[PDB]
């Protein structure tokens, strides 16, 4: 009955700070430096969260790491939109308690238009009156929404898992106070995460290439993920799974 949701609610990670020094002038290098540090700290929590999801450890251990490394951008963007919605009504981007983007930061970060798309995504939680239970189920399904075109180590295991998480989603909708219309809406929202994720992937890749010239620092796990895993997505070897 409520077992699936009990689990999702119990493993939801808590607040992560970026460690940003807000006394610092808002500059390109300092902002993306803080975001990267934020990314590394969140990644640590995403790994632990994913390993505790129902059935995840049924995946080959090789596949476990890969789906986390391919889907983390979308997961983090989606969670960030939810944070922004529930904390500042999506009026600004709430990356962390200590790293809230206003319009000035959007511009200095040189990714203003991507931020606007992130704010639009954020605004959807509000437009659709997304429930915390729908949020949690949708976020779990994002973990299973991007894979190699030539499939994973144990692809059949991934397919049943993904199948069951879509089922849990229909269930959370069907257990609400037109399910058909809701499901269509939440799948469109989920799909909308991917193009955004793809823009940020491109942006981080370009930044990492010119890192040593724009004075932006990359913590270890990120320099690795962005030079080993992200190019596979930008080169089309790894592609999102779209509903529509
Ligand atoms: C997932 C993070 C961090 C954690 C978070 O709540 C939201 C996002 C989405 C935007 C990402 C940034 C967009 C460009 C970026 O700043 C860089 O590419 C730095 O070079 C990124 C990729 C750093 C970091 O990873 C992100 F902030």
Swiss-Prot record:
- Enumerate the residue ranges of region (Interaction with CCAR1): 1-244
Tell me what the record says results from residue 72 to L: Strongly decreased transcription activation in the presence of androgen
Q: What is the lineage of its organism?
A: Eukaryota, Metazoa, Chordata, Craniata, Vertebrata
Query: What does the record say mutating residue 52 to T does?
Result: In prostate cancer; somatic mutation
Q: Where is the NR LBD domain?
A: 1-226
Q: Which residues of the full protein are shown?
A: 671 to 918 of 920
Q: Where is this site: Interaction with coactivator LXXL and FXXFY motifs?
A: 51
Tell me the impact of changing residue 217 to N: In prostate cancer
Query: Result of mutating residue 48 to E?
Result: In prostate cancer
Gene giving rise to this polypeptide: AR
Mutagenesis or variant effect for residue 191 to N: In AIS; loss of androgen binding
The annotated consequence of residue 165 to C reads: In AIS; loss of androgen binding
Which residues of this protein are annotated with the site description Interaction with coactivator FXXLF and FXXFY motifs? 224
Protein name, as recorded: Androgen receptor
Which region ranges are annotated with the description Interaction with LPXN? 1-244
Q: What does this protein do?
A: Steroid hormone receptors are ligand-activated transcription factors that regulate eukaryotic gene expression and affect cellular proliferation and differentiation in target tissues. Transcription factor activity is modulated by bound coactivator and corepressor proteins like ZBTB7A that recruits NCOR1 and NCOR2 to the androgen response elements/ARE on target genes, negatively regulating androgen receptor signaling and androgen-induced cell proliferation. Transcription activation is also down-regulated by NR0B2. Activated, but not phosphorylated, by HIPK3 and ZIPK/DAPK3.
Record remark: domains: Composed of three domains: a modulating N-terminal domain, a DNA-binding domain and a C-terminal ligand-binding domain. In the presence of bound steroid the ligand-binding domain interacts with the N-terminal modulating domain, and thereby activates AR transcription factor activity. Agonist binding is required for dimerization and binding to target DNA. The transcription factor activity of the complex formed by ligand-activated AR and DNA is modulated by interactions with coactivator and corepressor proteins.
């Amino acid at each position: 009955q409520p077992i699936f949701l009990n689990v999702l609610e119990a493993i939801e990670p808590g607040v992560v700070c970026a460690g940003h020094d807000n006394n610092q002038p808002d500059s390109f290098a300092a902002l993306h430096s803080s975001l990267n540090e934020l990314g590394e700290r969140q990644l640590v929590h995403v790994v632990k969260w994913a390993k505790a999801l129902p059935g995840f450890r049924n995946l080959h251990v090789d596949d476990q790491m890969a789906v986390i490394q391919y889907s983390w951008m979308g997961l983090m963007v989606f969670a960030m939109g939810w944070r922004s919605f529930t904390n500042v009504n999506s009026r600004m981007l709430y990356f962390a308690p200590d790293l809230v983007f206003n319009e000035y930061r959007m511009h200095k970060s040189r990714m203003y238009s991507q931020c606007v798309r992130m704010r639009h995504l954020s605004q959807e939680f509000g437009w659709l009156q997304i429930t915390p239970q729908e949020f949690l189920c949708m976020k779990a399904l994002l973990l299973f929404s991007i894979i190699p075109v030539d499939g994973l180590k144990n692809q059949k295991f991934f397919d049943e898992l993904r199948m069951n998480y879509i089922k849990e989603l229909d269930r959370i909708i069907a257990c609400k106070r037109s399910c058909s219309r809701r499901f269509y809406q939440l799948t469109k929202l989920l799909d909308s995460v991917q193009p955004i994720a793809r823009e940020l992937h491109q942006f981080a890749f370009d930044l990492l290439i010119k890192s040593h010239m724009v004075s932006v620092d990359f913590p270890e796990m990120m320099a690795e993920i962005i030079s080993v895993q992200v190019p596979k997505i930008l080169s089309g070897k790894v592609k999102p799974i779209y509903f529509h």
